Design an enzyme around this catalytic site. Structure first.
Site, PDB file in Angstrom:
ATOM      1  N   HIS A   1      13.417  -3.809   3.060  1.00 29.24           N
ATOM      2  CA  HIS A   1      12.597  -3.330   4.183  1.00 29.24           C
ATOM      3  C   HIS A   1      11.107  -3.418   3.836  1.00 29.24           C
ATOM      4  O   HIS A   1      10.286  -3.194   4.767  1.00 29.24           O
ATOM      5  CB  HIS A   1      13.077  -1.994   4.675  1.00 29.24           C
ATOM      6  CG  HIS A   1      12.579  -0.833   3.845  1.00 29.24           C
ATOM      7  ND1 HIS A   1      13.298  -0.172   2.898  1.00 29.24           N
ATOM      8  CD2 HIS A   1      11.390  -0.114   3.960  1.00 29.24           C
ATOM      9  CE1 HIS A   1      12.595   0.853   2.369  1.00 29.24           C
ATOM     10  NE2 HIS A   1      11.409   0.888   3.038  1.00 29.24           N
TER      11      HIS A   1
ATOM     12  N   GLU B   1      -1.104  -0.958 -12.833  1.00 26.79           N
ATOM     13  CA  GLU B   1      -1.863   0.000 -12.047  1.00 26.79           C
ATOM     14  C   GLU B   1      -1.629   1.418 -12.463  1.00 26.79           C
ATOM     15  O   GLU B   1      -0.498   1.841 -12.699  1.00 26.79           O
ATOM     16  CB  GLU B   1      -1.522  -0.126 -10.596  1.00 26.79           C
ATOM     17  CG  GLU B   1      -2.086  -1.382  -9.911  1.00 26.79           C
ATOM     18  CD  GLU B   1      -3.558  -1.259  -9.595  1.00 26.79           C
ATOM     19  OE1 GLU B   1      -4.233  -0.367 -10.157  1.00 26.79           O
ATOM     20  OE2 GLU B   1      -4.045  -2.093  -8.748  1.00 26.79           O
TER      21      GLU B   1
ATOM     22  N   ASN C   1      -4.608   4.200 -10.999  1.00 31.42           N
ATOM     23  CA  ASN C   1      -5.322   4.474  -9.784  1.00 31.42           C
ATOM     24  C   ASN C   1      -5.385   3.180  -8.983  1.00 31.42           C
ATOM     25  O   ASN C   1      -6.051   2.193  -9.401  1.00 31.42           O
ATOM     26  CB  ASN C   1      -6.736   4.980 -10.073  1.00 31.42           C
ATOM     27  CG  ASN C   1      -7.376   5.487  -8.804  1.00 31.42           C
ATOM     28  OD1 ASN C   1      -7.323   4.890  -7.761  1.00 31.42           O
ATOM     29  ND2 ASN C   1      -8.024   6.667  -8.909  1.00 31.42           N
TER      30      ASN C   1
ATOM     31  N   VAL D   1      -9.059   1.967  -7.943  1.00 26.89           N
ATOM     32  CA  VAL D   1     -10.096   1.757  -8.961  1.00 26.89           C
ATOM     33  C   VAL D   1      -9.586   0.727  -9.912  1.00 26.89           C
ATOM     34  O   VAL D   1      -8.453   0.864 -10.420  1.00 26.89           O
ATOM     35  CB  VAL D   1     -10.438   3.087  -9.693  1.00 26.89           C
ATOM     36  CG1 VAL D   1     -11.515   2.866 -10.755  1.00 26.89           C
ATOM     37  CG2 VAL D   1     -10.885   4.139  -8.665  1.00 26.89           C
TER      38      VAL D   1
ATOM     39  N   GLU E   1      -4.973  -3.876 -15.133  1.00 25.00           N
ATOM     40  CA  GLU E   1      -4.285  -4.509 -14.032  1.00 25.00           C
ATOM     41  C   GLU E   1      -4.072  -5.987 -14.263  1.00 25.00           C
ATOM     42  O   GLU E   1      -4.911  -6.715 -14.858  1.00 25.00           O
ATOM     43  CB  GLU E   1      -5.124  -4.440 -12.714  1.00 25.00           C
ATOM     44  CG  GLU E   1      -5.367  -2.964 -12.248  1.00 25.00           C
ATOM     45  CD  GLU E   1      -6.609  -2.250 -12.796  1.00 25.00           C
ATOM     46  OE1 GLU E   1      -7.268  -2.792 -13.764  1.00 25.00           O
ATOM     47  OE2 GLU E   1      -6.947  -1.194 -12.270  1.00 25.00           O
TER      48      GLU E   1
ATOM     49  N   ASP F   1      19.704  -3.071   0.914  1.00 25.66           N
ATOM     50  CA  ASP F   1      18.234  -2.967   0.988  1.00 25.66           C
ATOM     51  C   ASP F   1      17.609  -3.369  -0.327  1.00 25.66           C
ATOM     52  O   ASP F   1      17.123  -2.544  -1.142  1.00 25.66           O
ATOM     53  CB  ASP F   1      17.806  -1.579   1.425  1.00 25.66           C
ATOM     54  CG  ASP F   1      16.342  -1.494   1.777  1.00 25.66           C
ATOM     55  OD1 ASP F   1      15.679  -2.542   1.900  1.00 25.66           O
ATOM     56  OD2 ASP F   1      15.841  -0.329   1.898  1.00 25.66           O
TER      57      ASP F   1
ATOM     58  N   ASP G   1      11.231  14.905  -3.745  1.00 33.80           N
ATOM     59  CA  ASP G   1      11.852  13.684  -3.172  1.00 33.80           C
ATOM     60  C   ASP G   1      10.873  12.559  -3.223  1.00 33.80           C
ATOM     61  O   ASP G   1       9.668  12.725  -3.494  1.00 33.80           O
ATOM     62  CB  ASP G   1      12.218  13.986  -1.703  1.00 33.80           C
ATOM     63  CG  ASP G   1      13.210  13.072  -1.086  1.00 33.80           C
ATOM     64  OD1 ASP G   1      13.768  12.125  -1.667  1.00 33.80           O
ATOM     65  OD2 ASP G   1      13.455  13.288   0.144  1.00 33.80           O
ATOM     66  N   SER G   2      11.353  11.349  -3.006  1.00 36.24           N
ATOM     67  CA  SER G   2      10.497  10.212  -2.670  1.00 36.24           C
ATOM     68  C   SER G   2      10.104  10.263  -1.230  1.00 36.24           C
ATOM     69  O   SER G   2      10.750  10.943  -0.415  1.00 36.24           O
ATOM     70  CB  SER G   2      11.198   8.895  -3.016  1.00 36.24           C
ATOM     71  OG  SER G   2      12.414   8.774  -2.303  1.00 36.24           O
TER      72      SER G   2
ATOM     73  N   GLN H   1       7.514   8.127   2.193  1.00 30.69           N
ATOM     74  CA  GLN H   1       6.956   6.910   2.709  1.00 30.69           C
ATOM     75  C   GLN H   1       5.841   6.423   1.758  1.00 30.69           C
ATOM     76  O   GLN H   1       5.045   7.272   1.254  1.00 30.69           O
ATOM     77  CB  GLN H   1       6.352   7.277   4.066  1.00 30.69           C
ATOM     78  CG  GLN H   1       5.877   6.112   4.989  1.00 30.69           C
ATOM     79  CD  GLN H   1       4.751   5.213   4.454  1.00 30.69           C
ATOM     80  OE1 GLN H   1       3.680   5.642   3.959  1.00 30.69           O
ATOM     81  NE2 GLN H   1       4.966   3.940   4.586  1.00 30.69           N
ATOM     82  N   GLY H   2       5.851   5.133   1.451  1.00 30.47           N
ATOM     83  CA  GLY H   2       4.994   4.455   0.502  1.00 30.47           C
ATOM     84  C   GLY H   2       5.578   4.335  -0.914  1.00 30.47           C
ATOM     85  O   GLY H   2       5.079   3.533  -1.716  1.00 30.47           O
TER      86      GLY H   2
ATOM     87  N   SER I   1       8.727   3.458  -1.041  1.00 31.95           N
ATOM     88  CA  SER I   1       9.697   2.421  -0.675  1.00 31.95           C
ATOM     89  C   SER I   1       9.640   1.226  -1.604  1.00 31.95           C
ATOM     90  O   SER I   1       8.559   0.698  -1.875  1.00 31.95           O
ATOM     91  CB  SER I   1       9.399   1.875   0.778  1.00 31.95           C
ATOM     92  OG  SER I   1       9.880   2.867   1.657  1.00 31.95           O
ATOM     93  N   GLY I   2      10.821   0.791  -2.064  1.00 36.24           N
ATOM     94  CA  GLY I   2      10.868  -0.378  -2.885  1.00 36.24           C
ATOM     95  C   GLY I   2      10.743  -0.107  -4.393  1.00 36.24           C
ATOM     96  O   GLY I   2      11.013  -0.996  -5.208  1.00 36.24           O
TER      97      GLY I   2
HETATM   98  N1  LIG Z   1      13.321   9.896   0.515  1.00 40.11           N
HETATM   99  C1  LIG Z   1      12.849   9.658   1.875  1.00 40.11           C
HETATM  100  C2  LIG Z   1      12.086   8.395   1.993  1.00 40.11           C
HETATM  101  C3  LIG Z   1      11.984   7.382   0.980  1.00 40.11           C
HETATM  102  S1  LIG Z   1      11.021   6.065   1.526  1.00 40.11           S
HETATM  103  C4  LIG Z   1      10.765   6.786   3.102  1.00 40.11           C
HETATM  104  C5  LIG Z   1      10.031   6.338   4.191  1.00 40.11           C
HETATM  105  C6  LIG Z   1       9.950   7.119   5.402  1.00 40.11           C
HETATM  106  C7  LIG Z   1      10.593   8.300   5.453  1.00 40.11           C
HETATM  107  C8  LIG Z   1      11.361   8.850   4.317  1.00 40.11           C
HETATM  108  C9  LIG Z   1      11.404   8.057   3.149  1.00 40.11           C
HETATM  109 CA   LIG Z   2      -6.325   0.202 -10.566  1.00 42.04          CA
END
Ligand SMILES: NCc1csc2ccccc12
Ligand SMILES: [Ca+2]
Length: 223
Positions: A40, A52, A54, A57, A62, A84, A171-172, A174-175, A177-178
């Site tokens: 995704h 990486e 920061n 910066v 890097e 996925d 938890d993990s 958004q961002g 991801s992957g």
């Molecule tokens: N653990 C949840 C989670 C991981 S990536 C992502 C992207 C949007 C919403 C939730 C999440």
């Molecule tokens: Ca950097």
């Protein structure tokens, strides 16, 4: 990452940032030429950023290398998120060193209760939004299949597992991801999805990497 800790610069040396003008996903370096991420996270025009901490910066460790090819899994379904996973080849080999290093692939699937390290530059709040500049980390256990299924009726396939805390708070998000889920020095998961972040009874869901090792190896062998 919600409810995690600052990893420390370059302490997660296989963690990469996928950049298309800005960070949009994590990934995992698995050899000098290849990165594991989530399907995704597919887009054209990816620059892989290694070394990486920061991401705003330039700190001195890097390596920025453009992708030459993306390969989304042949059976990825973007509605269910089944399978996925994708591979990204780098236009040139990364320089490997203590701060930029590949993560081994599993030779066996990890069990529920195994401890893992999840990392990324995703959102740190469960309500609202705040994106960190430095890499965040979370230690979390793999949860049983049965608790994963009961948390998300009808939606967990054999290519997914849950990890985290049914109580919520860590938890993990958004961002992230992957990005990696590493357990005893092997890449066992990829940040895939969940319902919100850090909510009670809604742990994170991760791609089950050990199902993909032969696809990964044969793909690398021919590309
Ligand atoms: N653990 C949840 C989670 C991981 S990536 C992502 C992207 C949007 C919403 C939730 C999440
Ligand atoms: Ca950097």
């Amino acid at each position: 990452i919600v409810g995690g800790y600052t990893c420390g610069a370059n302490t997660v040396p296989y963690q990469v940032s996928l950049n298309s003008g800005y960070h949009f996903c994590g990934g995992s370096l698995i050899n000098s030429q290849w990165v594991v991420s989530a399907a995704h996270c597919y887009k054209s025009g990816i620059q892989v950023r290694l070394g990486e901490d920061n991401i705003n910066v330039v700190e001195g460790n890097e390596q920025f290398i453009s992708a030459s090819k993306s390969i989304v899994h042949p059976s990825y379904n973007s509605n269910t998120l089944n399978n996925d996973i994708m591979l990204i080849k780098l236009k040139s080999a990364a320089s490997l060193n203590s701060r930029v290093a590949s993560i081994s692939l599993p030779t066996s699937c990890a069990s529920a209760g195994t401890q893992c390290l999840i990392s990324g530059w995703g959102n740190t709040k469960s309500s609202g939004t705040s994106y960190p500049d430095v890499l965040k980390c979370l230690k979390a256990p793999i949860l049983s299949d049965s608790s994963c299924k009961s948390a998300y009726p009808g939606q967990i396939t054999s290519n997914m597992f849950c990890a985290g805390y049914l109580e919520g708070g860590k938890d993990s998000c958004q961002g992230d991801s992957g990005g990696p889920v590493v357990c005893s020095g092997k890449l066992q998961g990829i940040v895939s999805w969940g319902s919100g972040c850090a909510q009670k009874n809604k742990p994170g869901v991760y791609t089950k990497v050990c199902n993909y090792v032969s696809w990964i190896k044969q793909t690398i062998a021919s590309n």
